[PDB]
Amino acid sequence: SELLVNTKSGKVMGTRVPVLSSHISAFLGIPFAEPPVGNMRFRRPEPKKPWSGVWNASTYPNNCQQYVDEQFPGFSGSEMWNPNREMSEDCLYLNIWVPSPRPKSTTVMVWIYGGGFYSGSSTLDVYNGKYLAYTEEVVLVSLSYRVGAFGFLALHGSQEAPGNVGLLDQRMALQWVHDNIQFFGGDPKTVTIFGESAGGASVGMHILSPGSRDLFRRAILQSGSPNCPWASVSVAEGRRRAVELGRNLNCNLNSDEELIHCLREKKPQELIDVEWNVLPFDSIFRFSFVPVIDGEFFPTSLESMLNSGNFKKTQILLGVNKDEGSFFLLYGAPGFSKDSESKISREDFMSGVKLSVPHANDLGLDAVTLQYTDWMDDNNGIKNRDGLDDIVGDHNVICPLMHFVNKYTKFGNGTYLYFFNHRASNLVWPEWMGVIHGYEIEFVFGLPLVKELNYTAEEEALSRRIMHYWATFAKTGNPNEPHSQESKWPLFTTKEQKFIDLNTEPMKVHQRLRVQMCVFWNQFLPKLLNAT
Ligand SMILES: *[C@@H]1O[C@H](CO)[C@@H](O)[C@H](O)[C@H]1NC(C)=O
C-alpha cells in the first residue's frame, strides 16, 4: 500500500489528500523524539523508542506550549500564526507530504518555522506542504521544536537545562530524516533545510554547528541569519534570565538544582505568563529565551566562526522583504496602530529609536537618529513612520543578513540573494505596513494557486516562479534551469554583489543591497558603542 511505510522506528500509515484537483499522500504527526515531559523538561531530547503496530499518521500533532497572540481577537492577520492545534509539551513530531505515485529517490525540503524562538507551529495553513510537494515533485517535510523557556532556558554548566535544547530537537528531526526519508521515496543525500525569521536563523545555526553540518546538503534562509542581535545571548545573560524567571515564580534560588526543580513543578501556562518579564531592557524585537553561545553547539563566538570559515561550505539561497520592521512597531512602539496611517511625531520617533536599539547609549541613539532623519523636513509624519520601519528592519534583519552573506560567500560554494518586494493584493493588514515580515511565506508554499484564496493571476505566476527557484535550487544548487530562456538570477559574488527583486514585474538585477545603511549598522555603530 502507497499510504503505508515501514521505517526504522516502526510502521506508519498516512492519508490521501486532494490538492489542485489531484492528490498526494500525507504522513502527519510522525514522532521523532521521546515526549520531553516531567523530568525531561529543559533536557536534551531522547530518540523516540521504536513502536509495534501501525502509527496512525493521518492527522496533525499537538503544537508546543507557547505564548498566544491575543492582540487582535478575531482578526485573521494575527490569528493565522497562532497554534491551530491543542498545545502540549508532548509536541515533538514531523509531517511529510509525498508525491503520488511514491518517488524512488527525489529531492527533499525540510521546513523550520519561525516565531522568535518563543512561538510557532508546523501545522499552520500557510505552512501546508501539499502545493509544493505536488507542484515541484519534492518530498516536503516540516519539523517542530520546543520554544520559549521549554526550549531555551539556559543554566550553562548544568546538564539538566544546558540551553539550546530546541536546536537539538531540530537536529534530531534532521537525523530522523537522514535515517528514514528513503522509505518515503526521498533522497537523504539531497536535503535542503529552509526556514523564515528564527527558522532562517536556525538554518544558519546548523550550517555553523559542527554537530549539525553533516545532516543536510544545502540551505535557504528567509529573513533571518544566525548573527541577528535577537537570535542569541551569552551564557551569563541566559543564566541571569533563568534566575529572574525563577524569581517571578517565587522559586528557591540557592542552586541550579533547586531552581530547575521548582521550574519543573510549574504548569506550562505559569512559565508562559511571566516569560516577558525577564528582558533586560524596554525594547522591541527582543525575546526572552533564545539560543546561547555555549562552547558546545557553537564552539566559539559566531563572529569568529564566520571570520575563519568555521562552517559548512555549500550553496545557500537567502533574502529579505522590503518592510521587515512594521510588525514590531505596530505591536510595541508608541504612535502606531492597526487602523490608522500611523504618522509619527518627532517625540514618538525618539521613543521608537530608544525601543529599537535598546543596547545603545545616548551618543549611539544620536547617530541612529541623524542617519535616518531628513533634516529638511523633520516633521513629516510619513517619513518618521517609514524611517522607524527601516531602522527596525535594517538593524534586526537586513544588515545582519548582509554581514552573514558577505562572510559566507568568501568560503562557500555559491550564494543567491533576493529582495522580496511585492505587497499581496488581498493583505488584511493596513497599507502603511508595506511588504510585511513573513508575507513572502504564502508565495513560497504556493497559496496563490488556490483560486478561492483570491490572489491575482500575476500573483499566482509569481508564486510558481518562486516555488520553482526554491525547488530547482534544492535539486541542483542553482535556482536557474540549465537551458531555460527565462531571465537569469545571477550568483552573488564578493566582488559584484548582485541580487534580484522578486515581485510581479520583470526581474531586475541590482547591486549592494542597502549598503549605505548596513555600513552604518555593521561597521560604524558597533565601533562607536565599543569606544564609548
Ligand atoms: C563549487 O565547488 C566546485 C568543486 O569543489 C567548483 O568546481 C566550483 O567552482 C565551485 N563553485 C563556486 C561558485 O565556488
Ligand SMILES: *[C@H]1O[C@H](CO)[C@@H](O)[C@H](O)[C@H]1NC(C)=O
Ligand atoms: C486515526 O485517524 C483518525 C484520528 O482521529 C480517525 O479516523 C481514527 O481515530 C484513526 N483511523 C485509523 C484508520 O486508525
